[PDB]
């Protein structure tokens, strides 16, 4: 629940009327006339929004708001283009970085993230494992064997039956 | 227009220009043009088809015709393999016996089953 | 790029969907003319690149012969070529749009003009975007970690297994995609900078923050092909009739 | 917990209910990479015997790398679609 | 003899943090959870995959 | 040579003639990197190396190729070079 | 202490490194650093060789799976084999020696972060082209060399002609990648593996009718990227880069990667008879094409490159011989000639005021440079098979070997191979008289600036020196040796012809190169400063001559013009005369035609007659006629109606 200034919003405009076009006040190639503009490019800058004041206000105020901010970003741009105005530091925040540094990279993150370990439940790992099965059923006795003899005692069973069961779902064709 | 390509794109060109086409290698380097590096000056007219004309454009040897050039490497392919063909006839023969290998000629060793000992198996 | 990347794997996916399941004995008759189709798209319209005056226009016909590649896989009857044309349709998706934003995403906000002839010596004045220029080309060609390679490989194999000299004759892709594009970046690459062009600014934090994602998410799958098959491994079955 | 639902085959299950086609297309398909990793299991005996072996790899496993040959044409994916569009024997 | 030094560069760059935080991020992660083969005996972001049962 | 360059473009790879204030003090940086990657892959990637003859005994082989057999002779399968 | 990810990821290091810290380390930091990783990486592949030499298994390691399917598997494996352990201390060596000779070569280059970043990636993909244990691996380095040698030979952008050499290098490496790709889709259906340890299990089974279609594919790959004749014009049009760069492209490494394939696939080799004897007779003309071309081209640097693709000849030779120690043992020891010779070349050219190329102007700098010229000679007399150097042992014992085989045709190829030494003495001595011991040709400022360079040109010349004289002695006995079971290569016995080798060759057959090869060798330097009108005739018949050995025995001309330009033709043919002039014609602007006419004709149907009631009121009479006897001619017989139907759409239409 942020703050808004009625009156400060309509002096603004009141401030906006006197001051010349976006393509005059800075085509003159210092502070008589560039040093209220320098504060006025601030305004652009010094964040009063409101949250819930966009919701609980009616357009009239709205339509006043969006003509004094869609002057002063002129105002700012302008001056950025041809010279705060006159500062050079990086990296000025742009307008697009909130919500693709924090919610389209990291969700493009957590995707890569289950595409990972969402790949430990593959066919070929349950088929290796089902296979596995498959020969311990029936041959319960290579159980008996050590831990580690087991596993060239089930490759010897692989290697040597079948047990693939698929000609036992193909009953018409014999 | 010197290329048969060139001459078969005359009835298309209603209010092109139609320029003689001249590569932009075979011109001298020294005349000091807009662009040294692709010998050409700022508004000057392209050619139909310029792209086999430009520096980007192929090689382009000029010291043979290419006629010419095509006899004599078919000249030197001739007279290679003519000339090794030629000479399988006037070998000599050699002085010893391919030499043998025991065990009915190892047939066992790479590969094999007695009823299949006629594929594998040298020299016995 | 919502048209090269997106509407043009909805027919490989409405070949998958529509055409396969219901139309299995249909297309055992005729796979031999979807071969001379594909075939001659990879011949003719990767040939046809090498004359092109505008910029744009030579990574359309790239998508085109990629595209003629899939098709080729698709339509295998074999295991191998569905999910080769599957990580096609998935990396060409990221590599393209990635180049139209190459060509007229910056090039043509800069200098508004889209002829080749004025473009040469851009490594003087922008080095990276020259880098950019060159690893996304290089993954378009189909070297591999890129996850262009896996899906050519895989979808070439694939259209070898069905009919091996139609394979045979389709692997010279290749080379006649390496030939096009690698005379288009070594012309915009090299040379003096231009005569017509003023220095424009260095590609900016906006057009890297798009070029990475589109260059990281063809390496993830150059390297791992497998960060999918979790999902594709009943629909490389899902669509075979060879009883 | 290593789930191992039934086997369903296409013969005799009334292609008017979804629940058991589905589970056929499943079961068939299912099976047939369990078919599939016998060929992958020889293929990883086949490459231990060539390392073990050496230069006499010739005769001591002539008969996984022809086991190996074997198993090659006949054990991949092949399509439910093959068995369940067709009927033999009619 | 002097190679003519060019002005002083930090070293720690954003980029230079942003991709190492990253990829020793998604290390860490992977680390963290290949270490749960006998504290719990699944992986942890396992215990986030609720699919619905096949029947 | 020593022609003049312009210092506004920033490269990733240096530029024309990269030689900063303090590349003594960066030069630790990246050689604490290096030794630091060096050795963690060099320590990481050791489980995964085993040595190529010797891994197996040999009555595993020669079993194998009994079950091989087994399983050849179960088929009806000739040997490749029967005619 | 891995002794493999040390062999891996220290030039991966010694990549990356240079590029994400470029700006921030600068090129003095960089030289120091890119070099003594590529020196830990040697001196950990001189160790691991060493034990090797022990016992003989090797290591692999197993990383993630890259991709399984149904019947295909292919994983990350890296395996030092002997094969590849010799391969591995050539390119480790050879490039280690590389980075120290660009610290001093390239001391006023601009842009050496990128290129010691360059040379050091270079290395790696060698680094992982040799040591991979899948075909697929051999797919990954291959490549990336390719993609190496764009970004190499075109360090200088602004020039024109390294950019047209690269495009050139790469686009002619390309043409054997695809038949690479042939015969990777062949093997992986045939075998359905491409791991080596399944392939080399089962080869001896498949008939000899697919193991041509899959050594054609890999043949014409290795062709295409070691450089015989089919195409051969990428290695002097790689000249455009710098000597560096020259002595790794060419001294060992991507030479050497395309006999590496042949090396590989020496278990498949064996079972096919047909592609050994095409190899054969490739490797034995590009020997003779090279020494022809080498001797009549006055360019330094084109010398060497065609020294180097008329001993991949001799490479080849040994090939298809089925004699694969001597062409492994000759791929090491020539890695140690051509790096020396490269980069002695490169000492004396950066030694003048001008760094001029053409041996016609050098004249006499062997009082000026004895440094180059003792380094030089070493690699001339090892070039030419001296009979104390590592030269004898590498390369006449392969002039040996024709004459011992067992098939009666290979005594050809031992003239054959034999002309090729002697025109390889003749021009290594037009190299040492016409840029040391001849008149001065230069003005005068080159011979009061000639010297020598500081100590990063001295010292790799110096090793690679003492290489080049002692390690084919010290090596011989793994190689060649006798009953050595040092590789794994398994040949046929059958066709097995070394013991036949070493002892049937009489004295005369022995002797005649030793013998012919140092006669020749004083007979041109004689001929040169005594005489000299013998080689400066103007006869209007010996210059045609001269000028075809000159223009690289004319086909760089054959291939541009009938092949390139013939190809851009009708590629012109297809974009203008198919894609926009007629599959427009059956699309958007046929049809505008089309239905312009059509639309103006039924448009113009009633265009006249203003008095519109009379205009309309005969109109409805016809079609009240017309359709009444068109009714009565169709129930009489159908098909009689469908030409007046056509007619009538013909005259409503148009
Ligand atoms: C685990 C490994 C995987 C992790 C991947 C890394 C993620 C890091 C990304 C990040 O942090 O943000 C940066 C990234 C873009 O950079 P940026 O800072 O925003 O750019 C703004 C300005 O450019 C930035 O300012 P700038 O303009 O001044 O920068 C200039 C530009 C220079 O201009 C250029 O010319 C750029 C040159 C081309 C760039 C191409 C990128 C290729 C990178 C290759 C790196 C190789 C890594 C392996 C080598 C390891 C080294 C040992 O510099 C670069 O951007 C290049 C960066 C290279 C610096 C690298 C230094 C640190 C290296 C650390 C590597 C460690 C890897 C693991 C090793 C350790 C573990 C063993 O922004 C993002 O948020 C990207 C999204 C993050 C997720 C990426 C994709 C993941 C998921 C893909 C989709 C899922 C798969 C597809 C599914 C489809 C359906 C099936
Ligand atoms: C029987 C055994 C077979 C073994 C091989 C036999 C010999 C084959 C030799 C031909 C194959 C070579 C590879 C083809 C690619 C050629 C690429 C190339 O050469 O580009 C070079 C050219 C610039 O090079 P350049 O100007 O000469 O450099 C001078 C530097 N001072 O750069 C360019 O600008 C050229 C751009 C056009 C590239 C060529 C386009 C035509 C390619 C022809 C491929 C044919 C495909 C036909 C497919 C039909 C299939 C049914
Ligand atoms: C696979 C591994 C991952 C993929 C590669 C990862 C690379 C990541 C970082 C790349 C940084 C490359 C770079 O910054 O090169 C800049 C270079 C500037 O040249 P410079 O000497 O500074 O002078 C220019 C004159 N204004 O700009 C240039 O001159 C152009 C040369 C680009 C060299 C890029 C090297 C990487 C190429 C790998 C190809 C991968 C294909 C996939
Ligand atoms: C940079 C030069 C190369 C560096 C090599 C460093 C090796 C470090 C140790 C690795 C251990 C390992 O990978 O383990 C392998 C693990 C699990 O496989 P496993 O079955 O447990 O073991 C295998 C051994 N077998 C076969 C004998 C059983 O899978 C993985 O991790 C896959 C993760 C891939 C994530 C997606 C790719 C992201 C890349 C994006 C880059 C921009
Ligand atoms: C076949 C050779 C026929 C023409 C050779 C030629 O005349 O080529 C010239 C070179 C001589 O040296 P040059 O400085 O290049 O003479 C350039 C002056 N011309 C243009 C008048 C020729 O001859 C040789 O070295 C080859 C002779 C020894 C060959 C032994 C085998």
Request: hydrophobic share 35%; charged share 25%.
């Given at each position: 629940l942020r703050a808004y200034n009625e009156e400060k919003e309509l002096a603004l405009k009141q401030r906006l009327s006197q001051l010349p076009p976006p393509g005059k006040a800075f085509v003159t190639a210092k502070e008589a006339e560039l040093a209220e503009l320098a504060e006025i490019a601030a305004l652009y800058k010094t964040d009063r929004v409101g949250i819930l004041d966009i919701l609980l206000l009616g357009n009239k105020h709205a339509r006043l708001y969006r003509d004094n901010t869609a002057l002063l970003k002129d105002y700012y741009y302008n001056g950025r283009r041809i010279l705060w105005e006159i500062k050079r530091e990086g990296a000025e925040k742009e307008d697009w970085v909130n919500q693709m540094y924090f919610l389209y990279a990291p969700s493009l993150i957590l995707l890569l993230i289950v595409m990972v370990y969402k790949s430990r439940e593959d066919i070929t790992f349950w088929a290796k494992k089902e296979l596995d099965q498959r020969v311990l059923d029936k041959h319960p006795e290579i159980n008996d064997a050590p831990e580690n003899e087991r596993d060239a005692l089930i490759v010897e069973r692989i290697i040597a039956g079948d047990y693939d069961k698929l000609a036992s779902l193909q009953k018409k064709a014999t | 227009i010197r290329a048969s390509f060139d001459k078969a794109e005359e009835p298309m060109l209603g209010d092109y220009p139609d320029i003689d086409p001249f590569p932009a290698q075979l011109k001298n380097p020294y005349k000091k043009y807009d662009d040294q590096q692709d010998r050409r000056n700022l508004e000057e007219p392209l050619s139909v088809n310029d792209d086999l004309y430009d520096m980007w454009s192929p090689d382009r040897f000029t010291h043979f015709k290419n006629q010419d050039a095509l006899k004599y490497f078919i000249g030197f392919l001739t007279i290679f393999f003519g000339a090794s063909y030629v000479a399988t006839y006037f070998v000599p023969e050699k002085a010893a016996i391919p030499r043998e290998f025991p065990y009915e000629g190892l047939w066992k060793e790479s590969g094999g089953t007695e009823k299949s000992k006629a594929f594998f198996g040298q020299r016995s | 790029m919502i048209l090269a990347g997106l509407i043009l794997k909805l027919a490989l996916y409405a070949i998958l969907r529509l055409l396969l399941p219901l139309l299995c004995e249909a297309q055992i008759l005729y796979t031999p003319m979807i071969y001379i189709i594909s075939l001659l798209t990879i011949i003719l319209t990767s040939l046809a690149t090498?004359?092109?005056?505008?910029?744009?226009v030579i990574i359309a016909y790239s998508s085109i012969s990629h595209m003629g590649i899939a098709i080729l896989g698709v339509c295998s009857?074999?295991?191998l070529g569905i999910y080769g044309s599957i990580v096609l349709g998935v990396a060409h998706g990221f590599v393209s749009p990635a180049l139209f934003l190459i060509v007229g995403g910056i090039l043509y906000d800069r200098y508004h003009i889209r002829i080749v002839n004025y473009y040469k010596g851009l490594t003087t004045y922008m080095p990276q975007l020259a880098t950019y220029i060159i690893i996304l080309s290089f993954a378009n060609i189909g070297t591999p970690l890129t996850g262009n390679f896996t899906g050519e490989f895989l979808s070439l194999q694939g259209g070898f297994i069905r009919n091996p000299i139609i394979g045979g004759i389709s692997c010279i892709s290749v080379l006649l995609a390496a030939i096009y594009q690698l005379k288009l970046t070594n012309k915009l690459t090299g040379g003096i900078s231009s005569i017509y062009m003023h220095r424009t600014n260095d590609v900016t934090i906006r057009e890297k923050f798009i070029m990475n994602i589109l260059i990281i998410s063809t390496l993830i799958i150059g390297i791992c092909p497998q960060i999918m098959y979790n999902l594709l491994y009943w629909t490389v079955n899902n669509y075979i009739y060879i009883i | 917990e290593h789930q191992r639902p039934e086997l369903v085959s296409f013969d005799d299950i009334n292609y008017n209910d979804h629940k058991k086609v589905r589970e056929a297309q499943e079961s068939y398909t299912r099976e047939q990479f369990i078919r599939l990793e016998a060929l992958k299991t020889v293929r990883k005996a086949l490459e231990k015997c060539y390392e073990e072996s050496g230069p006499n790899h010739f005769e001591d496993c002539k008969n996984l790398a022809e086991q190996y040959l074997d198993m090659l044409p006949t054990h991949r994916l092949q399509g439910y679609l093959g068995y369940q569009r067709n009927d033999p024997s009619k | 003899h002097g190679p003519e030094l060019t002005p002083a560069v930090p070293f720690f760059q954003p980029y230079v943090l942003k991709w190492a935080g990253v990829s020793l991020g998604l290390v860490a992660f992977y680390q963290f959870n290949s270490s749960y083969e006998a504290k719990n005996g699944h992986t942890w972001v396992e215990t986030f995959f609720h699919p619905k049962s096949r029947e | 040579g020593r022609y003049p360059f312009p210092k506004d473009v920033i490269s990733m790879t240096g530029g024309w003639w990269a030689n900063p204030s303090n590349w003594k003090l960066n030069g630790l940086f990246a050689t604490g990197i290096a030794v630091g990657l060096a050795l963690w892959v060099s320590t990481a990637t050791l489980p995964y190396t085993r040595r190529r003859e010797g891994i197996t005994s040999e009555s595993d082989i020669s079993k194998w190729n009994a079950a091989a057999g087994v399983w050849r002779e179960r088929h009806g399968k000739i040997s490749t070079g029967e005619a | 202490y891995n002794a493999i990810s040390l062999i891996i990821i220290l030039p991966c290091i010694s990549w990356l490194f240079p590029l994400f810290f470029g700006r921030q380390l600068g090129y003095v930091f960089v030289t120091r650093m890119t070099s003594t990783l590529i020196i830990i990486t040697t001196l950990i592949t001189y160790y691991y060789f060493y034990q090797l030499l022990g016992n003989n298994n090797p290591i692999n390691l197993e990383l993630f799976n890259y991709l399984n399917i149904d019947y295909l598997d292919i994983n990350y494996n890296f395996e030092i084999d002997a094969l590849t352990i010799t391969m591995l201390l050539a390119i480790t060596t050879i490039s280690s020696m590389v980075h120290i000779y660009s610290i001093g070569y390239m001391e006023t280059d601009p842009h050496q972060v990128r290129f010691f970043s360059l040379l050091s990636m270079f290395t790696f993909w060698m680094i992982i082209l040799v040591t991979g244990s899948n075909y697929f691996v051999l797919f990954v380095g291959w490549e990336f060399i390719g993609v190496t040698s764009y970004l190499l030979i075109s360090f200088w952008v602004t020039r024109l002609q390294a950019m047209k050499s690269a495009l050139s290098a790469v686009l002619m490496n390309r043409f054997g990648d695809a038949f690479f790709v042939l015969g990777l889709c062949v093997i992986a259906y045939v075998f359905g593996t491409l791991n080596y340890s399944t392939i080399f299990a089962t080869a001896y089974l498949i008939n000899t009718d697919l193991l041509v279609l899959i050594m054609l594919a890999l043949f014409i790959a290795a062709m295409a990227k070691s450089a015989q004749?089919?195409?051969?014009?990428?290695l002097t049009l790689?000249?455009?880069?710098?000597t560096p760069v020259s002595s790794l492209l060419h001294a060992a490494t991507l030479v050497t990667a395309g006999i590496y394939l042949l090396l590989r696939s020496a278990n498949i080799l064996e079972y096919t008879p047909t592609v050994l004897f095409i190899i054969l007779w490739i490797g034995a003309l590009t020997t003779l094409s090279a020494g022809l071309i080498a001797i009549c081209s006055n360019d330094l640097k084109r010398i060497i490159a065609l020294s180097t693709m008329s001993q991949l000849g001799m490479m080849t030779i040994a090939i298809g011989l089925s004699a694969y120690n001597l062409a492994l043992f000759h791929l090491l020891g020539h890695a140690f000639f051509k790096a020396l010779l490269f980069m002695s070349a490169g000492s004396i050219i950066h030694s003048i005021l001008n760094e001029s190329q053409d041996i016609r102007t050098y004249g006499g700098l062997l009082s000026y440079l004895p440094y180059t010229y003792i380094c030089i000679t070493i690699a001339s007399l090892s070039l030419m098979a001296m009979p104390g150097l590592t030269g004898y042992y590498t390369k006449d014992i392969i002039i040996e070997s024709t004459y011992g085989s067992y098939s009666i045709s290979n005594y050809v190829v031992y003239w054959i191979a034999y002309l090729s030494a002697v025109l390889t003495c003749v021009y290594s001595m037009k190299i040492l008289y016409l840029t040391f011991y001849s008149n001065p040709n230069n003005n005068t400022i080159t011979y009061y600036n000639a010297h020598e360079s500081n100590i990063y040109i001295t010292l790799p010349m110096f090793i690679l020196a003492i290489f080049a004289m002692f390690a084919g002695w010290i090596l011989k006995d793994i190689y060649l040796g006798v009953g050595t079971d040092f590789v794994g290569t398994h040949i046929l016995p059958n066709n097995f012809s070394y013991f036949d080798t070493e002892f049937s060759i009489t004295q005369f057959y022995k002797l005649l190169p030793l013998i012919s090869a140092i006669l020749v060798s004083i007979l041109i330097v004689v001929l040169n400063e005594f005489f000299a009108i013998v080689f400066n005739l103007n006869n209007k018949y010996i210059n045609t001559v001269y000028s075809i050995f000159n223009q690289k025995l004319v086909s760089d001309q054959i291939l541009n013009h009938f092949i390139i330009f013939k190809g851009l033709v009708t590629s012109g043919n297809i974009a203008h005369?198919?894609?926009?002039?007629s599959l427009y014609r059956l699309g958007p602007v046929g049809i505008n035609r089309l239905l312009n006419k059509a639309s103006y004709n039924v448009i113009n149907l009633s265009s006249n007659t203003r008095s519109s009631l009379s205009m309309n009121s005969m109109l409805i009479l016809i079609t009240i006629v017309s359709l009444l006897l068109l009714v009565l001619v169709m129930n009489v017989n159908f098909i009689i109606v469908i030409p007046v139907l056509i007619s009538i759409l013909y005259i409503l239409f148009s």
């Open positions: - | - | 090498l004359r092109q005056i505008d910029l744009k009857n074999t295991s | - | - | - | 004749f089919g195409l051969h014009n990428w790689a000249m455009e880069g710098p005369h198919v894609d926009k002039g």
